[PDB]
Amino acid sequence: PNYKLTYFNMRGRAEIIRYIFAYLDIQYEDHRIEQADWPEIKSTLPFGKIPILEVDGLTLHQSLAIARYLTKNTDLAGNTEMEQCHVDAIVDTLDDFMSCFPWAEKKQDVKEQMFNELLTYNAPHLMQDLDTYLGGREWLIGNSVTWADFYWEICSTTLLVFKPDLLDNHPRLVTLRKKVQAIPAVANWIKRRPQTKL
Amino acid sequence: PNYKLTYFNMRGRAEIIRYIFAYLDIQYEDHRIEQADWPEIKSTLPFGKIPILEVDGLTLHQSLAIARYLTKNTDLAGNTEMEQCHVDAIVDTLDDFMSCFPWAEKKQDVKEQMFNELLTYNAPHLMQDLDTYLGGREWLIGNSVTWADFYWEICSTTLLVFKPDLLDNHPRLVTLRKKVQAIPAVANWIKRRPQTKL
Ligand SMILES: O=C(NC1CCN(CC(F)(F)F)CC1)c1ccc(-c2cccc(F)c2)nc1
Ligand SMILES: O=C(NC1CCN(CC(F)(F)F)CC1)c1ccc(-c2cccc(F)c2)nc1
Ligand SMILES: N[C@H](CCC(=O)N[C@@H](CS)C(=O)NCC(=O)O)C(=O)O
Ligand SMILES: N[C@H](CCC(=O)N[C@@H](CS)C(=O)NCC(=O)O)C(=O)O
Ligand SMILES: [Mg+2]
């Protein structure tokens, strides 16, 4: 199909889709919009949010809904139905926490207090639970890489921007980040993608 | 399978699981904990949040991950993979909104004013987008009921608690609520369930 991804010029909520396309070697148009044209383009979107994915004229929304759609019947999905549940659950746990950050907060002092509270109180508990969940296993779920592993690498890359010491006591989680980054198609994407803060 | 659902004594995030069990006529234990039992139970859970579903003693978490698991290969999932994407997307749009409410905010009136702002300034916009998306059709996705319609009905029930006029400009969304509520297995659960505020 002819795939057109629309999002801002940042990794953000589109990046999981971008990793999946890369990993599956699927051609798409990676459309990045100007904040210039955002207020205007906003009115054309189904629920006023991005990313959207256009597939032969049809519009899809919600990044994780799109991610799951693209990974169905692929080796990134989860091998059993129970495994697919665990993939979904880990993804939503990650996404719940990333959504707690007030990314569009205008008041800077309020923003900085909230980011710091989340990073110094809530983040370490989540890192602890993920690490224990992972155990000595090579990937988060099952025998092989799933898109939950991609999403771990994606979310923690952004977290590491604001809290560089986040994983000091979690070498097994650092090892997983490096495993995802070592996948040839992912490594290729990471070297070629636009370099943005977020 | 042996199913044990653990949550608080409220509809809340467990209710979507309870509708699915009701619709599929699945026996389960509806385990409702009190706050006093929570600290001990919490310390035993991999990610420390509820609802959880124990499937033959194996703990699953994340309400929507569990919901999708239970609807896999059923007539609630969406017929095609594209329909499944649309179901997933509408579910996350609804969940995104509900998760914006600071339910466990310690300071009152940062909570009460965030509630009023979300309900007054944001909820109408979402209802409009939902109505537009429904587009005069019978159900949110395709030609038959999906668990997206259940979740619409569940989320709107809770929103109506705080904003009785939520759907006064949207009679087609009221009609959809009533249609879900008239499904016999759902009607039966709604008349029999514990009556709680939330
Ligand atoms: O910076 C962020 N969002 C801004 C908000 C203001 N604007 C929008 C406006 F206001 F211009 F429309 C530009 C975009 C942002 C948001 C989410 C995540 C994210 C989410 C999930 C996983 C994850 F890893 C990262 N990362 C960055
Ligand atoms: O308020 C909430 N939960 C807390 C937990 C402790 N207690 C339970 C106690 F203590 F009362 F048992 C009450 C306060 C609450 C949380 C989520 C949702 C919700 C989320 C998504 C969709 C949706 F429809 C509803 N709704 C209510
Ligand atoms: N559930 C999220 C929601 C997407 C979302 O809220 N995206 C933000 C950008 S990261 C957005 O479109 N905000 C701009 C606005 O609200 O005007 C998803 O993964 O798709
Ligand atoms: N993404 C949510 C997360 C669940 C969640 O945060 N649940 C709340 C109750 S509604 C909870 O466990 N609160 C108790 C606590 O955090 O200690 C889901 O649907 O499962
Ligand atoms: Mg979510």
UniProtKB/Swiss-Prot annotation, chains A, B:
**A Gene Ontology MF term for this entry?**
glutathione transferase activity
- As given in the record, the signal peptide range reads none
Q: What Gene3D superfamilies does this protein map onto?
A: 1.20.1050.10, Glutaredoxin
Q: Which domain of life is it from?
A: Eukaryota
Q: Where in the numbering of this chain does the GST C-terminal domain appear?
A: 80-198
Q: Belongs to which family? A: Belongs to the GST superfamily. Sigma family.
Q: What is the name listed in the Swiss-Prot or TrEMBL entry for this protein?
A: Hematopoietic prostaglandin D synthase
Q: What is the lineage of its organism?
A: Eukaryota, Metazoa, Chordata, Craniata, Vertebrata
